[PDB]
Write a protein that binds this DNA or RNA. Structure first.
Ligand SMILES: [Mg+2]
Ligand SMILES: [Mg+2]
Lengths: 105, 115, 62, 71, 86
RNA sequence: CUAGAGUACGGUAGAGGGUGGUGGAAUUUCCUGUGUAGCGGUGAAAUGCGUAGAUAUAGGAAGGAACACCAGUGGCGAAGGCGACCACCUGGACUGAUACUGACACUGAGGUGCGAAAGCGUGGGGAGCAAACAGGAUUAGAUACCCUGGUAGUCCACGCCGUAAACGAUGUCGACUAGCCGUUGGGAUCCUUGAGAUCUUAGUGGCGCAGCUAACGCGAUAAGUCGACCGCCUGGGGAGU
């Protein structure tokens, strides 16, 4: 429960990422997991080279699903070429919205 | 042949010092070593011999111009900073000086301790 | 990294910035492998040389 | 007392669960080369120093902070 | 073991008390927890540091039974047969 | 009967285990460009590697293991041991409030387990390091130290062996006995701004009075004053044979 999936996509797929949001989160709603934030940090420059690119498109997302929808997005990120890194987390708490992109501008 | 704004590479071991003048493309123009200046021994490892080989690389580099140099210093040995003072002695505008040093986070294990 | 303005200033800004960063004593400890007991002697002798230094200075702080 | 106030950079405020998101905080605790600072220089309490080292290693993984001057 | 799985057992083998101290409460909680772990130790075979915790609970269970037998017999066999031990 | 002991309830801290996954720096082998005479090594040299284009230098690919800085008289574990990040299962300890059980405890011959490293069996895997070994040097002599190479092994799965300066050279458990300076984690009280204050438990360090000790030295983490159970010692070799 209460995961904090953060994943970044390819800079050439940042146009297509709007359909990529609901394509993943609709399957979570099939499991029975509501989503408490969905932030899109945008196109930024990395600190180093990840498969010889330098821009990305960060996607922040906090999901509270059961053990099956976690098995979904664990596999779908591995079977993609848009997404280049991911990080699944776990907190034992709830989620408020609008963390830092106000302050990051 | 004319190139400008080259890059000077300095490799400094405990027993020898190798200096190479290149371009941004990473291509050899002039290399010069401490052993080629005729020291060959205990005199080879001195920071004085890293001035003789430094200027001698800086004389076959004026074949192509190279009025601007960018220095990468690499190695633990002596003559690590004496070679830089023997670069603009030949009259080269040194823009910036940069440490490059291979430091493994864990790495392979080194050889055993001497006795 | 040291940019550039006379030249003697940027040398001493580079000899010092390398040492204040490090990567010169660490290279010197990569040329012989210490077995982890011998790395527990550095952890033992340096802890004595710090807690005894906090007390020997108090004699100067009398 | 600069090493004293930075102990209160986390304990005077209710910022106990630090995140790997506030890069404006984390850049105060990283040296010019890239390596992480000790805790006798900042003087932070060792509850938070352990908690500070995780948020570096996660932000380093997401390419938000470099490792060395090489890349 | 979960929280409500603890509350399911205390409601069942209560001695009309509302109280969690009696041996028929304590023996029941341990026995439901030994049976849960037996499939943890069929996947994890080389988990030795967690094998050590299970033998604490087994030896604790044979000490409360002899305290129970060392007081009464009627309370004993009404608990052995209701869990199927020995 | 509730002071030992155990349960139920909040709450923190951790390199405590096991099963997968993913990183970045560095080393080596290989490919390709530029470029041309040495590189490497040492008290000093030599064996070695080089125009059949090395070292250097730039681009690319493959693969293996270890996990800088944080890191500390710092933590956790019954002991051996345990440091990349995340998920996954999973053990115990601390701290507070409150109810319950009402002595349910301690130790333990025999017996049962977990046992560093080197080694052994079948199968994988082969980056570096490196016994055996080979060559050079030193040397009256040099199997040795030092130098250039280099195999089993170290790595993984499964099974075995059971010893170490397996160390705090100190069996486990319980109760009393002046102080002071540190430190991990946790509640307190407190004027409140604290770089706060004092007190109290659970650890982990430095000095010290009584006391003990052949002396050195330990000294609320006893070797002090006392209890309960167990193991073990009886001159040196011969011989842990
Ligand atoms: Mg030991
Ligand atoms: Mg002994």
């Amino acid at each position: 429960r209460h995961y904090e999936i953060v994943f970044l996509v390819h800079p050439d797929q940042s146009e297509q990422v709007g359909g990529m949001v609901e394509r993943y989160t609709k399957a979570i709603e099939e499991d029975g997991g509501k989503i408490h934030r969905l932030e899109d940090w945008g196109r930024r420059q990395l600190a180093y080279a990840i498969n010889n690119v330098h821009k990305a498109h960060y996607v922040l997302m906090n999901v509270e699903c059961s053990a099956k929808a976690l098995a979904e997005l664990e596999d779908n990120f591995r079977y993609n070429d848009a997404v280049i890194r991911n990080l699944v987390m776990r907190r034992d708490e709830a989620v408020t919205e609008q963390s830092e992109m106000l302050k990051a501008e | 042949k004319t190139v400008v704004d080259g890059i000077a590479h300095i490799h400094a071991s405990f027993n020898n010092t190798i200096v190479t003048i290149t371009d941004r493309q990473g291509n050899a123009l002039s290399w010069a070593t401490s052993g080629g200046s005729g020291f060959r021994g205990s005199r080879k490892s001195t920071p004085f011999a890293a001035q003789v080989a430094a200027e001698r690389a800086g004389q076959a580099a004026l074949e192509y111009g190279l009025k601007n140099l960018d220095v990468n210093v690499k190695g633990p040995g002596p003559g690590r900073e004496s070679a830089v003072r023997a670069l603009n002695a030949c009259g080269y505008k040194i823009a910036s000086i940069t440490d490059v040093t291979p430091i493994p986070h864990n790495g392979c294990r080194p050889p055993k301790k001497r006795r | 990294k040291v940019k550039e303005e006379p030249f003697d200033v940027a040398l001493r800004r580079f000899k010092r910035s390398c040492e204040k960063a490090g990567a010169l004593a660490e290279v010197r400890s990569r040329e012989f492998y210490e077995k982890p007991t011998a790395e527990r002697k550095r952890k033992a002798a340096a802890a004595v040389k710090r807690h005894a230094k906090k007390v020997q200075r108090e004699q100067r702080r009398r | 007392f600069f090493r004293r106030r930075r102990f209160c950079r986390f304990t005077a405020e209710g910022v106990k669960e630090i995140d790997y998101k506030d890069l404006n905080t984390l850049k105060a605790y990283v040296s010019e080369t890239g390596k992480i600072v000790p805790s006798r220089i900042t003087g932070t309490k060792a509850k938070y120093q352990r908690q500070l080292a995780t948020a570096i290693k996660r932000a380093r993984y997401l390419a938000l902070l470099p490792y060395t001057d090489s890349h | 073991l979960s929280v409500e799985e603890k509350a399911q057992i205390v409601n069942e083998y209560k001695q009309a008390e509302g109280d969690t101290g009696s041996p028929e409460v304590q023996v029941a909680l341990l026995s439901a927890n030994i049976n849960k772990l037996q499939d943890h130790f069929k996947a994890n075979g080389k988990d030795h540091h967690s094998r050590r915790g299970l033998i604490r609970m087994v030896n604790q269970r044979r000490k409360l039974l002899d305290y129970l037998k060392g007081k009464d017999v009627s309370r004993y066999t009404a608990l052995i047969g209701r869990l199927g031990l020995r």
